[PDB]
Structure formats: C-alpha cells, structure tokens
Write a protein that binds this ligand. Structure first.
Ligand SMILES: [Mn+2]
Ligand SMILES: [Mn+2]
Ligand SMILES: [Pt+2]
Ligand SMILES: [Pt+2]
Ligand SMILES: [Pt+2]
Ligand SMILES: [Pt+2]
Ligand SMILES: [Pt+2]
Ligand SMILES: [Pt+2]
Ligand SMILES: [Pt+2]
Ligand SMILES: [Pt+2]
Ligand SMILES: [Pt+2]
Ligand SMILES: [Pt+2]
Ligand SMILES: [Pt+2]
Ligand SMILES: [Pt+2]
Ligand SMILES: [Pt+2]
Ligand SMILES: [Pt+2]
Ligand SMILES: [Pt+2]
Ligand SMILES: [Pt+2]
Ligand SMILES: [Pt+2]
Ligand SMILES: [Pt+2]
Ligand SMILES: [Pt+2]
Ligand SMILES: [Pt+2]
Ligand SMILES: [Pt+2]
Ligand SMILES: [Pt+2]
Ligand SMILES: [Pt+2]
Ligand SMILES: [Pt+2]
Ligand SMILES: [Pt+2]
Ligand SMILES: [Pt+2]
Ligand SMILES: [Pt+2]
Ligand SMILES: [Pt+2]
Ligand SMILES: [Pt+2]
Lengths: 83, 105, 94, 98, 97, 78, 103, 99
DNA sequence: ATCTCCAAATATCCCTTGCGGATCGTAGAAAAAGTGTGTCAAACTGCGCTATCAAAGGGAAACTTCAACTGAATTCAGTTGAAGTTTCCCTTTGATAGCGCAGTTTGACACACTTTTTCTACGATCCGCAAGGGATATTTGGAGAT
DNA sequence: ATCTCCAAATATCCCTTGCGGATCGTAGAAAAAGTGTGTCAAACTGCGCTATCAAAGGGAAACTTCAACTGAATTCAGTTGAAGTTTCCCTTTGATAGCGCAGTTTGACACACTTTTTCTACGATCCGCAAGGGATATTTGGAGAT
C-alpha cells in the first residue's frame, strides 16, 4: 500500500516536547513546519547512505550497522547499536 | 607469566589489540609495543569514564550504571566532552539547563 | 557465531574503580562503542603517521603521538604515561 | 477555577524533559516516515527494528541539539520565542545546507 | 566633500571581496607564529611555505568567521558587529562550549 | 606580537567578510580568537615535526595539522 | 598502457600502484584502478570546465586559484564536495547583505 | 649524478591533458596546478578510504570497482555521483573489452 | 501580608527482570617455539634552503577632528501562543504464524600476487616568448549637494 | 528630481617572468609466467521481520479564553566612520654563513610467517535478590488567589 505524507506523524506536541528537552520556553506557530522540513532533510541524508551500505552488501534488510556507519559518515557517531 | 596483558600489568587484552591492528590494514607491520601501548590507553580511558559515570550513578541514588550516567559523566567533564564532542550516547538525554531570561521574574 | 566484545575487561576495570557498582546492558554497549571508537581514531592517525614518514610499521611511537593529537591535554598526559609505563613493564619481562 | 500563568507550565515541562531520556516522538509514526523515505530510494527494503531505533535516537538527538542552538538565536535577538528564522540562522552557521 | 558613514565601508567590501591578496602584513604574522611555536617547542625553524599555509588558513578562517558574525549581528536587527556576535557564531559552530 | 595583527588589518578581514560597521571591542576579541586558532594548528603541526625527528616545521606538517582540525587546505602539497 | 585500453587520460597504473601502497586492503582487483582513475578524470574535467569559463568571464586564458574558487563556490554540488576545503589565494564570492545597502 | 635530487610526483600532466580536452585555448598557472594536484589526492584518499572500510565492513579482502562505485555514491552529491558512476562504469566496460 | 490548591515528590506494597557471580563444556584464538628476511638505525655526506644581516623610502599604522547615524531604552496595543478542556483517533501492546532472507557451508577456480626481463612514460632540467603586471590616461558609474 | 564631483572601470602601452613546450635520462609500468587462495555460486536454514488482529486507553486535535510577548513607534547620547595629520615599521634587495634535511649504503634484528601446545572468552543456562518499575495513596512546596 502507498506511503504518503508521513512527516505529519511528527506531531506538534512531539515537536513541543523536543523543544522542551532543548530548553525552549516559547514556540511560534510557524516552527512545526520548519521542523518537519529539517527532520525530513536530516532523514533523507542518513537513510540515503544507510541504504547504499545495504545495497553494497547485496542485502534487502537495512541493519543497525548500515545506520551506524551512515551516521559516522555524516560526523554524527552514535553509541549503543554496534560498531 | 603467560599472557602479554599479565606481562604489561594490564586488564585490557594485548593479544586482541595486536590482532585487530594486523587485520585492519593500518600498516604492513605492527611493532611489539604498539598493542601494549594501545591496550593501556584504552584501559585508562575506560577507567576515567567508569569512574565519572560511577559518581553520577551515586549522586542519583543509584547502584547500576545506565547510559544517562555515562552522558552526565561525559558532558560534565570538560575533556571527555571534547573528546566525544561529535558523539551521541543513545538514551543519555541532555544536561539540565535553562537559560536565565526564561526564569520567572 | 562468536560475538567479540570488550565486556569482560570493562567489568574488570569497573570493579577496580567502583567495586559495588553494576552496569546495564545498554550502558555496556555504549562502553563497547567507545572502546572501538577510540581504538579506530588512534590506529587511524597512527596509520597516517607511518605513511607520512615512509614507514612500513606501526610502533608504540606512532600510538604515542596519535594519542597526543587525539586526546585533549590532561587526558593525553595520563594516557601517555599509562602507555609508556606498560611498555616499560612489558620489555622488563619475557 | 485555578489557572497557571503563561510560561509556568512551559518551564516545568523543560525540567521534566531535561531529566528524562525517553524518545519523544511516537514510535509507529516515526517508523512509517523512515519506510516512506527509504522507499523513495529503493523498493523492497526491510528494517531491523534496531536500525529504526538507531535512526530515531540520532534524529531526536539532532533536533534537540538544534533547538538549543535555535534558542540561543532567539535570545540573541532579545526574544524568548523561537521562530523559523532562528532555526535558519542556526543551520546556516552550522554549515548545514538544503 | 564628505561621504556619509558607511559609504566608504561599502566600497571597501566590494574591493576586498574582489581580490585574493592576504590582508595581514606578512612579518607581524610571522613573529606571532614563531612566538607561539616557541611556547610548544624550543629551537624550531620554518619552511617559508609553512608560514604561508598558516596565514592562508588563518585568514580564510577569520573571513568565514566574520560572515557568520555579521549574520548574527543582522539577526539582532543590527548592522554593527559586537563580541556577543562572534561568541554566538563560535558557539553555534561548536568551537566553543 | 599579538598586536601586530592591527586594527586596520582586522577591519580589512572584516570587509572581505562583508562587514560594514565594527564595534570598538571587536579588535580585542579577534586577537583572542586568532591566538586560539594558531595555538591549536601549531600545536598539531609541531607534534608532526617532533614525530618526524626534524627541527623544521614543514608545509606538509601544517597541511596535515589543518587536515586534522577538519580544515583541509589546497595549494601547498595536499 | 591500461589507460588507453580504457580511454582515459589519467594513469591507471599509478592509481593502481597507489592503491597497493596505501594499505586500503590486502588485495586490489583489476577493475578498481580503472574505475577510480575514471572518476578522478571526470571530476578534474568538471572543475576545469567551470574554472575555464571563469577565466573567460574574467577575460583570461590562464586559470588561477581565484577562478577555481569562483568555479567551486558558484557551483552548488562542487561547493558541497569542497565544503571543508580552503583554496589558497581564492578570496570570497562577492556577497553583500541586503540591509547593509542604502535605500 | 650519483647523488640524485629525490623525485616528486604529481598529476600535473594528466590534468593539463584534461584541460586541453575541455578548454583547448585555456592555460593554467602553477599555483592553480598545485590546487588541482591537491584536489586529486584529496578525492583519491576520500574514495579509497571508504572503499577500504566497505571491504572491512563486509569481511572481504579486495577493493573492487564495486567498492569504488558505492564509495563514490557515498562521497559525491547528486549529479556528480550520477555522472562519475557513468564515467567509471564505462571505462571498466571499455577496459575489459580491450585485450 | 495568608490561605487555597495543584502536580510533583514521597511512601507503601507487590513482582518482574536483568543483572553479577556461578559452574560448564568447548571453538577458536593467543602463546610458544622455530625460522626465514626485509625494514630501519646508524653513520657518513652534500647541499638546499632557513636564518640573518644592513639599509633606505614609501606606504601603512596611529592618532586626531568631528558629527551622522546607530543602538539602546521606553512605551504601548494588537497579536498570538499558552493553558485548560473535550472528544475520540490511533498508538501501543501482546501473540501468532508464515516465510523471506540473512548468514553459514562447501567445492571449483578465476584472479590476484609474486618474480624476472623488456619496454617506455614521466620527472628533471632548460628558457623563448606571450599572457599578465604595472603604470597613466580617459571613460563611466554614482553619491552628495542644492 | 537635476547639476557638480569623486573614485573605480576600462583603454592603452611597455616591461617582466613564469607558462609551457622541448631535451634527456630512469624508475616504474607493462609483458610473460608460474601458484594459491578469496571469492563466488549453489545448497539449506531458522532468526526475526512483516503482517494482522484486537482490546485499551493515552495522547493528539480542535476548541475557547486571555496574558503577555513581539515589534512598531519614538527618542537621543554616544560610538563609529570619514577625513586629515602624524609617527613608525614593513617590505624589498643582496648575499653569505652553515643548519639540518635528505640521499646513500648496510647488516643486526625485529617482525612475518607457520606449526603445535595451551588456555582465554564466548555461548548456554540457573540463581539470589536488590533494584527497579509500575499501580495506588498521601504529603508536600509554592504558584496563584483572596
Ligand atoms: Mn514514495
Ligand atoms: Mn570544450
Ligand atoms: Pt558491524
Ligand atoms: Pt607530503
Ligand atoms: Pt548477564
Ligand atoms: Pt580447537
Ligand atoms: Pt621465535
Ligand atoms: Pt635480508
Ligand atoms: Pt657535511
Ligand atoms: Pt651555499
Ligand atoms: Pt627610512
Ligand atoms: Pt621616508
Ligand atoms: Pt610617507
Ligand atoms: Pt536604530
Ligand atoms: Pt493591548
Ligand atoms: Pt492563536
Ligand atoms: Pt513460524
Ligand atoms: Pt596584456
Ligand atoms: Pt554620472
Ligand atoms: Pt633501469
Ligand atoms: Pt626500474
Ligand atoms: Pt586454495
Ligand atoms: Pt528453512
Ligand atoms: Pt482516556
Ligand atoms: Pt488522556
Ligand atoms: Pt521587545
Ligand atoms: Pt551628543
Ligand atoms: Pt655554504
Ligand atoms: Pt642491506
Ligand atoms: Pt507550602
Ligand atoms: Pt505567591
């Protein structure tokens, strides 16, 4: 079945919560769509690289390692999932 | 004394570090002391983090180290924070910190 | 198949440093990432040093200057000293 | 009926979310988003659930750090309210593009 | 005849953005390098290109830094760059805690 | 020595940077900032020199040092 | 030469030697230096193409570092690829912020 | 003779050749040549570096044109990636033709 | 100044689990010991290039004069985003089963590597000549004044 | 909105020097050949990913109200920039003095390689039990209200 418009599952309250963790007291109504934009770009970049690691391995399943390697490449090393 | 760790006075595994340097194409040849030196450095740094995370566990009335303790440890320490400046500790959260201007007045 | 990990050494060092304190599985996975990570950065820079200087071999000397380049000030001082001390002790036997 | 003044709950939400470490975006929505995006690169991909959990940990870390920078940009401009131009400024100075 | 405040400044911008010549005088910069190297190791010499490298690096770095500082100034509805601007740029760069 | 980096020189840099108006306090900050930059690069450059058992800081030493700080420089032996 | 068998200006033998001396892996396949030499060729072709025009636009028959700077920073993709590189003697793109200009 | 003045080695000739292929009436200053030489080395390393890791990640002992390919895909942005993958795939096709 | 009350913190009980400390049996890897060999430390040498020196003028940095215009402070109101409420969508949770495919296994071998001889591309070195630098004039594009 | 007034742009011409082509010699690439092992293709497999369902309720969406924040408007002391005067040192030029970089030759030794002996560390499995961690109740510190 066709996947569409899923960036809207990244809800307003969920964006509010992350801003809180980041110390933000007041949030303009325009922030929610800017954030979605940015998240999407962030995910496109990491996922593009993870998927390339998957294809290179001749696999159909994206692993924690493809993601960990993908993040490493973008200078965003992650601890907790192998490597 | 049989093991190279035992010889070097070390907990971290000198044989393993030797093998990983050889099978990682860092150079054709690996000198005798390099894995010794390197296992020592690795042991030291883990001791420094465990120490600091250990303290954080105790400050939060806790007995067992979790990722939040490692994260508190790392980012409260000027030097570990720099070394892991570009690193994300899964499940670590962030430091409690609220800028002044946002406090009620 | 065997999954290699630094887990046992990290426990050992943890008992030396905080003898009545445990570590969660996730906390350990993080420790294992950290050890692999720092290892990579050191071996990596050591590799370059040998290349830059037309050498075929990684010696404790490359590790040492790799350490000096990668670790911030105080951490470089102590690690350098723990390093040399272990090599010194290691040659002293056999 | 009792009423907290604007900002009081916002401050206590900050303490609350600064103490905890749980993922703040819902889990299934996030997963649909990743699958949608993967799919635009290659059809027939499957994900280890931890590959997804990893992506979520990285994404929440990134966004949280970005809001800290965004707040610093709002405050720099004598404001208390984060705005798109704050995020834009943060991203520009970070060397993030597109 | 008097140009208004900012008019010559604008002209300067056009001029310096159009050239690629170094803007710190070579010798004062060289002294600074040897002094600093001195604090790290005594009895050291320098290939002349090495100093060059350091100057190219240093100015590219600062120029880039001023672009960023300027944006922060403008973000605050200002036109004048202040230390708070540099401080913010460097923080957002993650050069500073 | 740090004052050899003069007010007019700093202004010139700020201009290439696109800066029209400069607060009087900027010139001191820039000297501070430049010190920290040179310190770090030269720290690394000299580490490479020492390691090569040389007494001369080479262009390569610097290029390597600039590379480690993630500031790759083209035009000197890359 | 392997370069001719592959129709490349870039030296397939050198790239091959250099891949053996860099300790990238225990062994190097036959195709790898060809593919790499080719990519290196295409990329230097790409730069020179835009650099040249910037020599032209600037009324010159010689490419100098400044033209390489203009080529790189005026091209979105090359600007990304050399995001963390400084071209010595390159200067900057002329760029002045709107609000700094007079009405 | 007897004592030989070392021997530097660069890409300057192949670069000059390629400059011909695209700008026959255009030349190149020595400093800009230096920069191009840096560019080739830089890219070379970035690429072989990835390929090496790809081989490690996948428990394999050889760097093939397949690792070079995905290294390029990871390294280069959109359009550059696409063209470089063409230029590279074609040379290999052509190289394996010629015997 | 004092009371009302709301949500986070503290207290109580129950209980699941994931941890550390076992004991286990066992593949795989480290150590041990022998041997082959190439890397690099040393010692001796040449000369490339870094330091330095001494001078002289020309332009840059420093300091000064002034007031335009900027940033900083104050004020205020329309805007807008926070708090709280209500409705009910859709995430979470727990179990199920089917199977797609990740990962382990095994023989056949193409393909890389290694060694030696033969061929030649590319670095070193050389300098004539034109693209570019530098100097002076003349045109053009704008700002500040009235 | 039009007329004087700088400063950068463009036009021109004579010198300068580094492009770029040519000469020559070698080190490195190619050719040919013998050897083996990493990679590949094909067979078999069961962890765990997708898929679903179904009940439960926690959280999102949509709504009203209004407090307070943003930012528009206004004022002005004073910090900058522009232009002039003054003081200071950077840059250029011509070497010569010799530091220390890098070339060359070499054999002692340290590390690679491979085979046999020894034992570390991993995967499987169980246990005491303190540490949590969740459902339920109470007390508590202080925001906001009277
Ligand atoms: Mn799609
Ligand atoms: Mn063309
Ligand atoms: Pt892995
Ligand atoms: Pt080099
Ligand atoms: Pt356990
Ligand atoms: Pt065995
Ligand atoms: Pt032996
Ligand atoms: Pt030998
Ligand atoms: Pt000598
Ligand atoms: Pt001499
Ligand atoms: Pt003088
Ligand atoms: Pt004078
Ligand atoms: Pt003068
Ligand atoms: Pt203003
Ligand atoms: Pt109002
Ligand atoms: Pt609203
Ligand atoms: Pt099943
Ligand atoms: Pt000309
Ligand atoms: Pt005009
Ligand atoms: Pt020869
Ligand atoms: Pt040869
Ligand atoms: Pt074999
Ligand atoms: Pt099966
Ligand atoms: Pt409910
Ligand atoms: Pt609810
Ligand atoms: Pt305001
Ligand atoms: Pt005044
Ligand atoms: Pt001499
Ligand atoms: Pt020898
Ligand atoms: Pt109270
Ligand atoms: Pt109160």
């Amino acid at each position: 079945k066709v996947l569409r418009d899923n960036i809207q599952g990244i809800t307003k309250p969920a964006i509010r919560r992350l801003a809180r963790r980041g110390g933000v007291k007041r949030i303009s109504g325009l922030i929610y769509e800017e954030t979605r934009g940015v998240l999407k770009v962030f995910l496109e970049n990491v996922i593009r690289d993870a998927v390339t690691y998957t294809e290179h391995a001749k696999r159909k399943t994206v692993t924690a390692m493809d993601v960990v390697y993908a993040l490493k490449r973008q200078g965003r090393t992650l601890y907790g999932f192998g490597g | 004394a049989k093991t190279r760790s035992s010889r070097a006075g070390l907990q971290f595994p000198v044989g393993r570090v030797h093998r990983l340097l050889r099978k990682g194409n860092y150079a054709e040849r690996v000198g005798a002391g390099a894995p010794v030196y390197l296992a020592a450095v690795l042991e030291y740094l883990t001791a420094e983090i465990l120490e600091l995370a250990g303290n954080a566990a105790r400050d939060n009335k806790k007995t067992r180290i979790i990722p939040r303790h490692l994260q508190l440890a790392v980012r409260n320490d000027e030097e570990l924070n720099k070394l892991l400046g570009r690193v994300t500790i899964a499940q670590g959260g962030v430091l409690p910190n609220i800028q002044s201007v946002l406090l009620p007045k | 198949t065997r999954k290699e990990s630094y887990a046992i050494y990290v426990y050992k060092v943890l008992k030396q440093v905080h003898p009545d304190t445990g570590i969660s599985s996730k906390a350990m996975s993080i420790m294992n990432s950290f050890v692999n990570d720092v290892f990579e950065r050191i071996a990596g820079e050591a590799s370059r040093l040998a290349h830059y200087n037309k050498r075929s071999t990684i010696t404790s000397r490359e590790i040492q200057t790799a350490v000096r380049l990668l670790l911030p000030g105080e951490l470089a001082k102590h690690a350098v000293s723990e390093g040399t001390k272990a090599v010194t002790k290691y040659t002293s036997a056999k | 009926p009792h009423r907290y003044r604007p900002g009081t709950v916002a401050l206590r939400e900050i303490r609350r979310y600064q103490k905890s470490t749980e993922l703040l975006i819902r889990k299934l929505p996030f997963q649909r988003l990743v699958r949608e995006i993967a799919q635009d690169f290659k059809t027939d991909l499957r994900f280890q659930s931890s590959a997804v959990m990893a992506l979520q940990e990285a994404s929440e870390a990134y966004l949280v750090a970005l809001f800290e920078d965004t707040n610093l940009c709002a405050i720099h401009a004598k404001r208390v309210t984060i705005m798109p131009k704050d995020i834009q400024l943060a991203r520009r100075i970070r060397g993030e593009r597109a």
